[PDB]
Amino acid sequence: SPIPVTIREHAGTWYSTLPDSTVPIYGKTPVAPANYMVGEYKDFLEIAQIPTFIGNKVPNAVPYIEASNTAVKTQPLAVYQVTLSCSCLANTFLAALSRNFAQYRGSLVYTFVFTGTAMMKGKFLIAYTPPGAGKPTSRDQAMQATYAIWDLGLNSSYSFTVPFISPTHFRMVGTDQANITNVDGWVTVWQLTPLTYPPGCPTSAKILTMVSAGKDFSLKMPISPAPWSPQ
Amino acid sequence: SPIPVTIREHAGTWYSTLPDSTVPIYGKTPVAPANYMVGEYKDFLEIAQIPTFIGNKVPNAVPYIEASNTAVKTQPLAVYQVTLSCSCLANTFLAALSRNFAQYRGSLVYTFVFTGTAMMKGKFLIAYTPPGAGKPTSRDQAMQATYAIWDLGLNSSYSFTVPFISPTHFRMVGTDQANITNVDGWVTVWQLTPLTYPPGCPTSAKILTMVSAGKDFSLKMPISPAPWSPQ
Amino acid sequence: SEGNEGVIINNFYSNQYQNSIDLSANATGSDPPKTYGQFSNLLSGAVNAFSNMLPLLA
Amino acid sequence: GVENAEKGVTENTDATADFVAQPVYLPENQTKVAFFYDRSSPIGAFAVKSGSLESGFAPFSNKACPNSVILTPGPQFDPAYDQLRPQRLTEIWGNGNEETSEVFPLKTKQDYSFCLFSPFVYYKCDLEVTLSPHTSGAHGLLVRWCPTGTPTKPTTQVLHEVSSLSEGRTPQVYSAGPGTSNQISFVVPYNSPLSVLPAVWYNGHKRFDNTGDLGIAPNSDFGTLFFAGTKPDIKFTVYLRYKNMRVFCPRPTVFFPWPTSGDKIDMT
Amino acid sequence: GVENAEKGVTENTDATADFVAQPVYLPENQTKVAFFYDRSSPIGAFAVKSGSLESGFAPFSNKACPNSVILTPGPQFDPAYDQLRPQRLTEIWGNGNEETSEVFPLKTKQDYSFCLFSPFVYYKCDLEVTLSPHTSGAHGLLVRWCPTGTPTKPTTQVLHEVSSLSEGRTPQVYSAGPGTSNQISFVVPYNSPLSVLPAVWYNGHKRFDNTGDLGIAPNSDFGTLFFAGTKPDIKFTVYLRYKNMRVFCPRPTVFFPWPTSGDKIDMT
Fold this sequence. Notes:
The structure is cut from a larger assembly and holds two copies of chain A, one copy of chain C and two copies of chain D. By secondary structure, chain A is mainly β.
């Protein structure tokens, strides 16, 4: 009547991620009601959608880019690599969230908030260039890829979504080494028309830059990034 | 047909509080009928409600306080901290019970029994002051908090309940170190009117002081206090 | 959702033991049950009505 | 609320009686008696004598770490006869016996926690016992359990080369192998001929002769345990766990010293 | 898509809003909070003092490898009182304390991963603990777990020859035999008197005296663990696993240093 068992070779091992529970030692303990509580979330995707600041001019990072009164088709206002590893994104919640997973999929959202004067006017060309032929070198080449024209007026910001264009269903989150001329392409910001203004107004303005996940965005396989010290 | 098992890493441990039973070695033993027995209880809460004596004038403890023929608004007859750790409560069943648990919640009941002459008369102001502004220093400040006026007459005692006023659902039973100016406030007893009497009667009386749990009172998580020796 | 547990078998320890007990407090308070068990001392003869009565003062 | 405590019974309230308040009840089950004592606590350290595995048993103690133990939460031993079979006592003996001595650690064997808090006159329960060798290396332990009031002098060796503990049909337990976890566990039934057991004191004598010595009621324990084993140098702790505890008649607990210090205590 | 971020809320899109595209959603469940923290991570290495198995406990550390541990993912220790009971801290201490020193490995004890990524203000959960001896030979370990806010000075030895850890009815765990797997595992309930716990910072003091020292809310941990054992030379790792995690109010995470290098990072 005692039951016969066969002991597996792995007898005694401890698995840090075992899909199971252990021995309870202090049962029947009621907790302190926490039912008045608010603000709970349950999925990181629930908040990955909130835009945080992209760092410009690293390592002297500022949360914005500057538009000028000159449109050089040869000069991007910004060039971001589309990699959740860009030093550019290093401190966005998107990047901080993403660094705990192995792969991502879906839309990335670059939000621009114009902060100049109400009296200023201007147009920007924001483009996404998939990899393969290198980064575009003039607005004329960028304009050949996915892009949008942002006109300044009553409405303050512009939300640009870079479409997930990829051979694989998912893309690796982080880079092992550095990713070349690769990565997954580039977001470049250009002036189409120069910032124009009347007399009595500054001749340049700051554009706030943020990033977030699109409704499309997914992350999978939780891991740990290489440990670091903020200092 | 022998069944394959995976041995957990914790193989061989002994848990002092395991929610389970062990091997029986002497079965089918009938007991001696104890069915004539009376007086059984099943929950400590069942008896925590019986008042026991508060010790006054520690370490020369007496089970009572003394009322006089003078009402000094500046002089409390007693000041108890509302802590199940007060040296004041050290020998009440409430305190002895409570010291085996981590937290409590609910009403504390301070019972006063007048033991003076039938010919005496008098009025007391009993107050509970929540923490935050320190202990009251005169009956005038106590009177600003929760209080009751106890009038002497035919009925011998007065049952004062200190309401559970707290930010947390539960309060810690015992103190780690000593609790300052904290603890959970104070019960202070003051004379409103002096003890008055006719000729031929003593000019002071003893008031018996006891404490008990209210119907509200709860205790949770059984532990062990620091060991002590009564001597 | 749930965590990282994916065993088919019913938990061997019951819940009140495997987990903490989530309770909820209502804003307006709750009445203790009337009695905590059946232990009690009893007071009898508290009142009156019946004796060698009404020879007894008014 | 006005009241009259002289009646011997006092009406219970909540903040609701005298002030504008609300009751604040919340359920919990850790205050039930059965739940409270249904956990293990130690009664002392014991030892085995050299080569007891293959010879006649004989009372003996290592460092006031004896050979046998009475299953009871009350005091027993009496360090002065560490070499005699142990007995139940009516007092706890300090660590030393003169001024300059110390109370802890106690010399006698008892469930100090049970002693410190048992607000009942009588109780009934089953006893779960745990033997824990203070070693993580192999350990052999032979145990003989005798119901209360039965023969407790396992002194005659009847079989050549077999411990005298290991004799008869009296329950014997033995753990000893290279793959054991060294500890032993088991639960014993309630064998006192008494209906319920005195928890603290029993105000009567042992014989009708009134050869006056009050305190303990005869056969009011769970029996005696005798040990024989192979590591005469390792000591082991013995723990008690009260299974389905029942208590009758509340009574006072042990006195706690007045803080000739503050207006509160702490820990230790 | 034109938008107005000043409102504090921004409409979410997919490539579909401005271009000729299609949504590309695919389900996954590894981003749920509960799933994410329901895995073990280490908080540091600990040690046992010599002969603690049979004597009074006393704070002590081996190489800044102490004796007891507070169950919390936050920093604790303070290498300067490696011989004092440990305490919760409001900062992490580097490996050295002067220029020429090093940040890793850290000296304090904490769940560095939790610290690095906890985008919530408050949380609630049960704690699963794993003790792993750094040895594949026999190992004896005695553990005492005390709920938060209860007595934590397991200093008086009450029973002769029994560890002072091994006293009372406070949960004690012990593994020690030639056939064990040496490791210990168990899960403790949530015992803070607080409704929910501060995950990073608590902007308030300890007393109403405002004897100003903000940071940690009192009794906001899962209790303290005390260790006694037989291999005073083997250290063991302690790991935490958050069972049924719940978090409230998103907040920022730890700063990541600007690559004063490329336009991307890597690993280490």
